[PDB]
Design a protein around this ligand. Structure first.
Ligand code: BJP
Length: 263
């Protein structure tokens, strides 16, 4: 709704930064509303969903096991590794690393998973293969959150991220069992409470993933809908603000309230 676009512009004014926005119809693929759709923004932690999608496609091909366990060391630990740091001892299975990467944004768990699939170059190839010729992952955690102005490394476009999430989630790409598993992980998101979840009415469904990085970067990707079923895709990225975390979360949650209102 254009009123939502007003809020996106109000946000750009508040944060003193650009805001990329996109609403997608989950069923048809139709674009509902947009803003800075083809500009590049840093994915930050939102790439974790893509990562686990590639991991799931390997599992579907029998090239990987969810039950497979992985061991690592203190040597592998990166800042912000809430679960991983807890099992230095017993290691973790593929499944748990994805859970950890998505529901808690665990940095080390992402790094371990990237290694398993072939690193950033392979992720990029995976994406490019499925029709996304824009989204690129160049670095590992946590340098990928640098967000230096104009750098194309580790970025996406709101338009590209939206359709790719759509394909993962509803395309024939992943098995039914894997798509479901991916949705399940997103739905259990334990760290995005102040963002869109904060504007959701009771009974609605939401499967999401957020990100935060240097230079005021912040963003979220999500599939939501009323009555326990997702029906739309919303992507929101911002970069360049001098605003604090709270103000940044406030603006995003404000865009979501507008989205709901005009549903
Ligand atoms: B990710 O953005 O690449 C990665 C981990 C992270 C940190 C904070 C919030 C989220 C989120 O809300 O989805 C994801 N980013 C970093 O590791 C940067 C960082 C930022 C702030 C605290 C710790 C790390």
């Amino acid at each position: 709704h254009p009123e939502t676009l007003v809020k996106v512009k109000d946000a750009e004014d508040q944060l003193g930064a650009r805001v990329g926005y996109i609403e997608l119809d989950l069923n048809s693929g139709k674009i509902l509303e947009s803003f800075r759709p083809e500009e590049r923004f840093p994915m930050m932690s939102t790439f974790k969903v893509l990562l686990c999608g590639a991991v799931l496609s390997r599992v579907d091909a029998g090239q990987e096991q969810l039950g497979r366990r992985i061991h690592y060391s203190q040597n592998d630990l990166v800042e912000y590794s809430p679960v991983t740091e807890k099992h230095l001892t017993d290691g973790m299975t593929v499944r748990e690393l994805c859970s950890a990467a998505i529901t808690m944004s665990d940095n080390t768990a992402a790094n371990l998973l990237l290694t398993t699939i072939g690193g950033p170059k392979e992720l990029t190839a995976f994406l490019h293969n499925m029709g996304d010729h824009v989204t690129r992952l160049d670095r590992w955690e946590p340098e990928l959150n640098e967000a230096i102005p104009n750098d194309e490394r580790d970025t996406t476009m709101p338009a590209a991220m939206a359709t790719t999430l759509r394909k993962l989630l509803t395309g024939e790409l992943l098995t039914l069992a894997s798509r479901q598993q991916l949705i399940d992980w997103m739905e259990a998101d334990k760290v995005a409470g102040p963002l869109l979840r904060s504007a959701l009415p009771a009974g609605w469904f939401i499967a999401d993933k957020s990100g935060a990085g240097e230079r005021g970067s912040r963003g979220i990707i999500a599939a939501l809908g009323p009555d326990g079923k997702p029906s739309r895709i919303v992507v929101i990225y911002t970069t360049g603000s001098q605003a604090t975390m709270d103000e940044r979360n406030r603006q995003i949650a404000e865009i979501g309230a507008s989205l709901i209102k005009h549903w």
